[model samples]
Target chain A: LSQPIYKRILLKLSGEALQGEDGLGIDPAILDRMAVEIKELVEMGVEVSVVLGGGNLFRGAKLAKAGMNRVVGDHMGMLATVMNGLAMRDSLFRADVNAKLMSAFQLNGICDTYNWSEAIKMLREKRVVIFSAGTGNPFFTTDSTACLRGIEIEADVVLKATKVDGVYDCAKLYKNLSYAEVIDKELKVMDLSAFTLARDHGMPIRVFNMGKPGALRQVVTGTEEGTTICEG
Target chain B: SQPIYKRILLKLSGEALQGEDGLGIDPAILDRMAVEIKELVEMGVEVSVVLGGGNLFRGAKLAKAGMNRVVGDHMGMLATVMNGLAMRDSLFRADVNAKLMSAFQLNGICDTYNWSEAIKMLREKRVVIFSAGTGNPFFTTDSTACLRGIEIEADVVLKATKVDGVYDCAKLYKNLSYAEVIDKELKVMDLSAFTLARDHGMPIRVFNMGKPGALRQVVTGTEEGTTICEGHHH
Candidate 1:
């Protein structure tokens, strides 16, 4: 059951995933659960890099109505992700997992800046690298960041944790689909930029709910626990 | 007539912009500085700037109040971004072509710092405002001025000080070598900034911005203020 097919994975976690039993901020209980799940992936001999979103603390567009500069609002949102990254890094460390938080924009001494070479090296050393700040640019979603980083680090697959079990159509799950098929059908699985990036690089993406215990392990082990998308 | 230096980096302090308020930017000072920058643009001098944000937030003070050091510093960096946005607006109002680039990236406002892109922008005569000190904490904006100057291949780092120049005693030191500044431990700039400039062989000029035509004088190599380089000159 522990055998793994993917040696390396880029895991994308939404900010809402960390917000549990509350509407805002990170909940310690949820963070601990995510940490434990991640540690399991590491213990199973799978290298993991996590890309996190900042929707929990802030949504830049939401602030636009308040007459704030869109760019400045996005900057505030980016810092929120940085805050989340700090908390997640601490939780992972408490779980006895070697983790480092690297941001798109560097905050020295707090966390390292995102560098592909260093990230790859850290992955090889089995230290879980947490990517934050969403490509250090506004108007780009965490999904694009996940695909960009997944391609940059050459991860075997990008795992996206979603609320649903997997890609569903008419309330029925699709076990397998090609990238082009999803785009053609307008399944709305991911933003076009992110999906195209993964499709072009031939990087597979698996969408599944991380709530299920051992679900990550199952997906990485080729057990087909979720819907998988790849080149046709 | 052409300026002495083809390109230069200007470092402005937040305190200078605050004027009588001693905190936040004063519109009068901002517009005045924009006019001075416009003069440089008129002279065909390529200019770039690194703006400080000591006026808006002080991370060290917050840290003493028990806030986390890094978090406080991030807040401070955000302050600099605000200052940059203000400065860019001022420059625009003065009809000076300007672009704001930050070490901290945020879309829809300004672009992120890239050595190649920055150089190209400067070559196009756009005054680039560099914000977010060194993109790191525990580093002063003075160090950022030096770093950006070196990165941009600027001819000199022009520091706008309240004083006329580095003083030897009753008289102002018009020009001094890096060795002299270090040997006597002159406070023209921070140790990190001075060391970086010295190592890079980039010249730095300190001048009084309050005085009219001071910037123009410095740019023309008239020795209006203290000029520091590898060798001493009377």
Candidate 2:
């Protein structure tokens, strides 16, 4: 038996990732696939913490543009994050993977109270950690929340699950360009805020397509199918 | 002498619970305080404590960096709830009858604030802990203690301090012996907290919590620290 390549990693799953081809709410098929990937990672001796985005349910910026109060819209967005977190927990449970959901906002009934000690304990016990509530306030995106959590949990690398195979030289990659084609591109994998935070904290970011079968496992095993963003 | 009120609200600053060196809570000091409080319970005096969150964490520093004060305070409230939960668990381990009630509902960790339930728990001799800063944004936990004292109808609000008794100035100024008793008009408490206590006609006792058995002594009506009551004569 060989030791796992990494001790801990943060997996960023967008809300749309959970929707599959339906493109709204949660699709059980997509979640089951995600669960299988996550469970396999756990069995490989890698500790995983997940940060879920809520773009499928509500967009705070979009709502604010539509005349909703900015703060209230942000809170609604946070709640949407909680919904995604709970769904992920359910998926993990179905896969028989030990998991816990901790929300930054103190919603006692739905999730465990968020505390650093509790999160560490979950990680120590090998249970997957799902962070909810987007830093517990408005004006902060889930990407930034993921970065903060990665630092707090001391994650080795952030495995950013994306729709595209990896960052393309342009906005979209040509069909001829395979996964390996974007490996050395200068374009960032994740959002600017998330990329900067990871770069600042010296944490590497690996961008892989969640829709691609076996992509997550490939990244964890160090075969490196997608773009790897590391500090210069 | 009339039977002194059997229930007292003991307020502790998070720093005092930190014991010798500040930063984190010292378990030994907490145990000592718990033992003293347990002794009071054994003597038939009900005890409820309100602890500050400064020792573990504070949110005002972030609020000063342009974060909203209310949001910062709510985060601090969460910290207090965490502290209260920890203390409640520790007290339970010490074989003390304890129940934690938070103004902010944390569900399983602690019970939601209810006057009848709190009073019933206290009457049953449980050490009740009040947390979450009155469940509102603006009020401090100091005011929460005063409000809880009046709601629980406690004889007095025991303000635990570093010094054994209230002094004219910071205890560093003069090596004054502990005051046998003090007038309510003598600035024994912060103006906001003092005004609340006075309005509720509740006496405030200032005492050294760091000293061993100080809490029990105050509960037993022993002559050890300063006692401030309503009405004064110059």
Candidate 3:
């Protein structure tokens, strides 16, 4: 079988994607569709790992503004990611794929705590890994975690699923942007910590529209499906 | 009369809370535990409890069933949290002030574990229940108990177990030195736990909670069980 351009990938999925069109919480239809999409990657012999966001379940920032302690709210958000992780794992299981749910904080009977070596072994054995809990600490965003997990798992690239196809400059699409250029242009790509991790570690990030059919497959296949951010 | 110890960290096994030949928390057992802890609080003794979850989960069986050790350990941690919550409620029902904190952040459910806050709560004479082990895999609740004892500067760790005391070669040890426990290779607790306790010169008392009034006697320095402290090997 022909090899994928990127043998291993860490996919950054926003919680909103799990919402589908339900406007709140997780949508079963969306989970099923996404599981199948991930299944396609595994069939292509690509090792896939995902770091999920928790904005859909509980927007920590919004709740924090309502007099709730920010740290507590963030912890709640962390739990939300675990909830989504369980849901996503269930979908993958129903889809007949071997998916594992790992968390930054230990959740009894819910999932396994994230261990770097164990995660790598699972990926090599063709298991899809879903990382939750955002570094197991408060104040770190899922974006930063996406980069951290990608580097730890030795993923060739971090595929960030976004609403847009790629980075844009007002009216035109920026096909590729260097780390420095993205900073100099004031482009809103990822959070500073996330970009710093990718830049410092030399891990490239591909921003693509997951809404588009076959976009993830194309991105991993090096078919120019999204904008790549890396060395010029 | 003044209590022998001003502050004590109690480590309870989850199995002790279950009925004989049963799983999960037994209400009658929990009620009796609350009464025992109340006796300490009434004596002006600061109490901090660390509970294990062996009753609700045993990772060894799951590991043999093809489950990852980390996953199984995590399940055990959650089980500890459940026990912590139940114990806290029991303490409250007994009119003893209690606070539940978890190493794993579960803010909606319980307060996050903090040594400083725990110390303050202990000073206020409120019982602090530490659940969820060390928030990491492989570290047992025994280690958590040791860590919490050191953090809170407890005079001693009252380790409540089903057995009466530590044993070497299957014999009960009424009194033993930390060095002896290590030398004899007794599996009382994990080596890491023993190392921490030994390094800090923290005394750990192993006793059978099923023995009525045994906890009170230990706290009163009556020595109802095995006491391992910094002492001569002989």
Candidate 4:
């Protein structure tokens, strides 16, 4: 609130984070609270973009185990992510926030097609860009999508919203970590692909508890509410 | 299965996909259509598609009924994406390697539609589905068919309609000319779409989607339905 520090950041949210405790579909209250937090930062003149994951809605493993084609199953899983992105966009809309839902694939009617210039333009115009689908390829996690998109947009840091807040060392949250430290410590923090991409690019990835109310706003203003994996 | 055109763009309106029920996707019909597409691929024709959302939501209808035009249109666009997913699923079941790319981006769901990429996929012989109707509001899927056809450089636009073909004032035109379409003022498709196609010298073939083996016959030059094509006259 006291003059935003991180001017622009990418917010990575998991499907479970958006859905309720029962973890099926989306919960209005949860989305409302999440949207409220995002809205707060936008008002503070912070550019916020999002990459949403879909593990909660559909898991490729379960379907693949049941004998679905692996490539076909992954594509279906990606579609599930799009549905989740739509829910996020709807929530962001009602909270007095303007959201631009962009997908890696061209489903133009539902959302905007991902264009580099257009995405940056939307962020500048203060529209909360909700990114759905993953890497648009098989054999990659949504975490990699976050880092890849983050790098493309040149976001200052990636605020990774996880089930558990931050990277824990023993029983305590680390609050911060260097790229080498996360590796040396063997934290088992995030997807290896996502972590490797972030480390290689020196892009800061802030891990936080989406379950905790107002954690996003707190982290953006430099209040230190989560574990940040970066050069430190 | 011996093909006439090397590549074709099938423009399917949302209505064509919806049968007597006239709402959502009719699974039985969709599966049959899916099988037809697979057969087309098997016949060695590179197929790309442009789909509509009238079955899910039609923006023009909803807007006339009092919804905000763009919002209604967006919903329609979303509907097309949903339709794209359904078609892709069906194509997968039929053992065809179909890719659903969008004129707009839906990352993780489908590949973002790129002209060169679509062309490459066609060369690879994948049945690439172009969804989301040109990725802009105010553009009909018909117009999208024209746009995508030009982008993909397809030989012609195969409009799979409920009717057997584009008709005369009373009935069907076995094959019509572009000049005749204007002289007759046949409003079978969106005028913008027709104009765009005309500008690009792209031909349109109208056939009954419900007719078994009609698409296969038409593409194979077996003389299926109405072929509205480019003519020397204006």
Candidate 1, residues A112-224, lDDT tens digits: the string is: 99877799999999999999887665444688788878887879999999877899984889989998789677897886656766776688999998877778778888747
The per-prediction i-RMS, to one decimal, reads: 15.0, 7.3, 11.2, 5.4
Say which candidate scores most in lDDT: 3
Interface RMSD of 3: 11.2
The residue ranges of model 3 lying beyond 4 angstroms of the native Cα positions read: A1-232, B168-171, B232-234
Candidate rank order under lDDT: 3, 4, 1, 2
DockQ of each: 0.02, 0.05, 0.02, 0.07
Residues A1-232 of candidate 2: C-alpha lDDT, one tens digit per residue: 4335688988888877887576788888888888998999899888999999898887567567789888898888889989999889888988999888888887643567688777988898999999988788887777788888988888887777988787666666432322223344545455567656766687776778888988888888864577776654
lDDT of each: 0.83, 0.77, 0.85, 0.84
Per-model chain B TM-scores are: 0.93, 0.86, 0.94, 0.94
Colliding pairs, model 3: none
Using DockQ as the measure, which candidate wins? 4
At residue A186, candidate 1 shows an lDDT of 80
Name the weakest run of 10 consecutive residues (lDDT summed) in model 3 chain A: A62-71
> What TM-score does chain A reach in every model?
0.95, 0.88, 0.96, 0.94
TM-score of each: 0.54, 0.49, 0.54, 0.52
State the lDDT at B157 in candidate 4. Answer: 92
List of clashing residue pairs for candidate 2: none
Question: For residues B1-234, could you state the per-residue lDDT of candidate 3 as single tens digits?
Answer: 357898999999889898886888889989999998998898899999999998898777668889766568789999999999999899999999999999877968999987779899999989999998876554568878887787778999989987788776477788888888867777777665776788779999999888997888888765578888898643
After TM-score superposition, the amount by which residue A100's alpha carbon in candidate 1 deviates from its true location, in angstroms, is 0.8
Give the better candidate number (1 or 2) by lDDT: 1
Candidate 1: segments with Cα more than 4 A from true spot: B1-234
| Distance from true location, Cα of A185 in model 3, Å | 60
DockQ of 2: 0.05
